[PDB]
Symmetry: C2
Subunit: 435 residues, 2 copies
């Protein structure tokens, strides 16, 4: 089967609604994807839906003969890491703890898939609340609900379908729990400190009302620190700081879903580190390759929590060993080359360019925003946004939509300023055409 027959072969078995290209696995590199059909190079601001930290075929992985041997050893088989331990696994775990670890969150758990990472954070909270209730004379049947935000995306699995609320297509006709959902007080243009404070106060009021009308039954609050799929919606640290206090007042855990924000994209290991709010549990995935949770803080106050008791959380494989070996090497590169700091600096650059675009096209380029390399802007209508994406595709630049009117940038951590300039140049070319 040849590159030009790929879409035909897949089309016999599946819906083929992806990109028009066929990925050349060998010739792609860094910030560029190569179409195996034409040999055309595409500038990658999409990074497999923000799951690639270093881009395709990074030199530090490709040129490392010792790593090749390690990777090959892992890739030939697929052990059940939950039952059977290896040096390859232990090396990954120790470097994860070193590079991304938080001393307050020592409990680590790994699984395949971002939705399942979030689910296991939820399971930890449900167990914790039930047991905490029981220890304080409250019915252990209580503690089954999840406070969450409007516009949230946490995945497409059994529990996360009850949380995710972006496009109706994702959740329609699937059974859901009736869990309390509150307004998301995200930052928007033309709102000053007092205006933002009032918006936050209303979400806080709704949150308080949920806790008070469902006594002892809310196990946790879950949020993305920055809402990705919902449209790159940013929140003030003040909002999460207030939620942290409110969670503590009602003995509920605070969970950050860092599946999209995590592993350096915002300029720190985790976005929460810049918001100065301490979570009890963090769910991670995408860039980490293997998914999972880190837990601690109040979790430890219940001695028989799911991290202390065998067989409460599990899967067959306990994450993919190949992903663990790849991730170990990726984390070593991040640490050695100071890629978090590079993300801060290049992120400031990208943001500055988007500000310039907003000045040049004031009625078209709206609400330029970002933290680190996680940047976005919006257009007046969905039609304008969709057209800009088509125009960029024609110019060999890959970006992703979000929400009704957002264009998202998700470059690799290794993106150069010249590559950012190229992306911006394409947007500038395309804009007069869309207007």
């Amino acid at each position: 089967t040849t590159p030009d027959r790929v879409h035909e072969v897949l089309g016999r078995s599946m819906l083929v609604d992806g990109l028009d290209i066929v990925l050349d696995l060998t010739r792609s590199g860094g910030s560029y994807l190569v179409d195996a059909i034409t040999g055309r190079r595409y500038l990658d601001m999409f990074t497999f839906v923000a799951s690639s930290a270093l881009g395709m075929n990074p030199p530090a992985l490709v040129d490392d003969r010792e790593f090749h041997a390690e990777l090959m050893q892992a890739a030939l088989n697929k052990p059940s890491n939950s039952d059977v331990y290896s040096v390859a696994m232990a090396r990954f775990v120790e470097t994860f703890a070193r590079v991304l670890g938080d001393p307050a969150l020592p409990h680590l758990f790994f699984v395949e898939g971002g939705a399942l990472a979030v689910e296991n954070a939820l399971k930890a909270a449900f167990d914790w609340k039930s047991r905490h209730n029981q220890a304080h004379g409250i019915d252990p049947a209580l503690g089954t609900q999840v406070l969450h935000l409007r516009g949230a995306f946490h995945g497409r699995s059994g529990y996360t379908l009850s949380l995710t609320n972006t496009k109706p297509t994702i959740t329609a006709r699937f059974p859901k729990f009736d869990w309390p959902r509150i307004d998301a007080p995200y930052m928007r243009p033309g709102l000053d400190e007092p205006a933002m404070a009032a918006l936050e106060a209303e979400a806080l009021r709704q949150a308080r009302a949920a806790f008070e009308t469902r006594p002892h039954d809310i196990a946790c609050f879950v949020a993305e620190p920055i809402q990705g799929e919902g449209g790159d919606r940013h929140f003030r640290p003040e909002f999460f700081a207030a939620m942290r206090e409110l969670c503590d007042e009602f003995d509920a855990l605070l969970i950050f879903d860092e599946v999209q924000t995590g592993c350096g994209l915002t300029g720190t290991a985790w976005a929460y580190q810049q918001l100065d709010v301490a979570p009890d549990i963090v769910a991670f995935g995408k860039k980490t390759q293997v998914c999972g949770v880190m837990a601690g803080r109040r979790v430890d106050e219940v001695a028989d929590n799911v991290f202390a008791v065998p067989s409460r959380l599990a899967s067959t494989w306990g994450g993919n060993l190949t992903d663990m070996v790849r991730a170990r090497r990726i984390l070593e590169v991040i640490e050695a080359e100071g890629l978090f700091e590079r993300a801060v600096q290049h992120g400031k650059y990208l943001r500055a360019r988007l500000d310039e675009l907003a000045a040049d096209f004031p009625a078209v380029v709206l609400d330029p925003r970002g933290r680190g390399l996680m940047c976005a802007f919006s257009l007046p209508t969905t039609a304008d946004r969709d057209e800009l994406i088509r125009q960029l595709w024609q110019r060999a630049v890959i970006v992703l939509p979000a929400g009704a009117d957002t264009v998202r940038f998700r470059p690799p951590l290794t993106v150069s300023t010249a590559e950012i300039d190229a992306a911006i140049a394409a947007v500038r070319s395309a804009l007069p055409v869309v207007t």
Copy 2:
């Protein structure tokens, strides 16, 4: 970090309740695992919880230089296969369809994880029932419940926690849907045709009552063709044939969870092929490396089902590309070496040996049973069963428990008769010690 420090390193971050050994990834091969600490070889009747079809480091994969290059190309990166197609992916899909495909079930969907494979089968059914209801004048809010069996294991995710019912430890304190659950009329010793028929009739009665008291609200019936974790419980074809008719009468889909039974273990591609019952959806995982569903039959009667409409089912990665490349090669070996037939023949051999054990130890070795290489026997008590497993471990044979009193055999498809003899010899040595 050295083999002797693996448990210490992992123990800082996780609960370390797995096997005492450290897996040597290089020296393990075929039906043998190697402990990196001692160099002791362990006879493997466990195969990473039945997820290894060919055992460790199969020669056809290890000696194939062309495959090495293909695997390395896949392993270096992790593309989002849902968005971005490759030759490596298309080759996997076409060989999957060739080797394991069913002409009645042309729709394929891939995902990481067995629980998520089952969840996507459920999502397909929920959507189908709602839309089928709508097309026939019935409220589209109806069609949200899942008929399932006692003793079932379908995973540990949001929807599957409402189905799984083996050990309380798996499901306690996690929120569940109230879905209808019926008795499992599995075969047991000392029950003749009429006795089995009466047991089945009672389960059928319970099933009928569920359909009639929850009108238009049961979307599907889900079952394992042979219950694995619940204790290798086998069902007569007559039971599933009756359930098939009953599902059709009430316009509900029939889903087989073949995550444990699938990919040749029972002697055919799928266990359902030997039961002569046609499912609408099959969920697969474990041995297939990449997980997912095959769908067809009645699914196609709803033209806007989830396999026809974009973005109803999805994940970031669409399965792991490394797993796809490995699985392609594994399937080619199965096809080329006639491993399904080998499983039939060696399975008959293993079963014969267990019958002999039952004759020699009539009060201790109970209910010897199996289909293909999926074989088991039971002991009088849980204490006897647990002790036998410890005694086998001491003799370097790895087997898995199931239920309260079952010992399961899960050899690779490539197991030899001498290796089966070795396993049986160890059981014979251990039994006088446990009695």
